[PDB]
Design a protein around this nucleic acid. Sequence first.
RNA 1: GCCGGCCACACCUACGGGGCCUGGUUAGUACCUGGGAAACCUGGGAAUACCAGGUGCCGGC
Length: 87
Amino acid sequence: MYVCHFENCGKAFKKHNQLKVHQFSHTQQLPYECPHEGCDKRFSLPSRLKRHEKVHAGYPCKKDDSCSFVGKTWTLYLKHVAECHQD
RNA sequence: GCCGGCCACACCUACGGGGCCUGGUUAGUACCUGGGAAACCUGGGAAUACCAGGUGCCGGC
Ligand SMILES: [Mg+2]
Ligand SMILES: [Mg+2]
Ligand SMILES: [Mg+2]
Ligand SMILES: [Mg+2]
Ligand SMILES: [Zn+2]
Ligand SMILES: [Zn+2]
Ligand SMILES: [Zn+2]
């Protein structure tokens, strides 16, 4: 079991993630921080972070070998297909 | 509708779904950090698979 002692909170958690997450109430800082260089962004849960990292991740065009495009955002990857590959 | 913000719940589809997100389980496990003679303890912590629903909101002409 995982128990916090913030201020004798007591609260007992099964997984140490549930714990950390719970430190939002006490204090305030959003627990989950971002590892990418120069990205002062923080989040509430860990799932919400995993999804954010998909940003710094890429969005590579896999519509054909000849094409080796890599957009910076989903929107951009879409515009790419919107023009470069029609019909 | 166009644009922009967010960066797929936004996308594709033989229209059956696929993909993606979300919440449980796999799993506090496999596995690395490090302490230890060791039992264990400390801090991180998957993959894979499976169940349960959801599928674009905001701002400007
Ligand atoms: Mg940073
Ligand atoms: Mg748009
Ligand atoms: Mg441990
Ligand atoms: Mg509008
Ligand atoms: Zn607490
Ligand atoms: Zn970031
Ligand atoms: Zn392409």
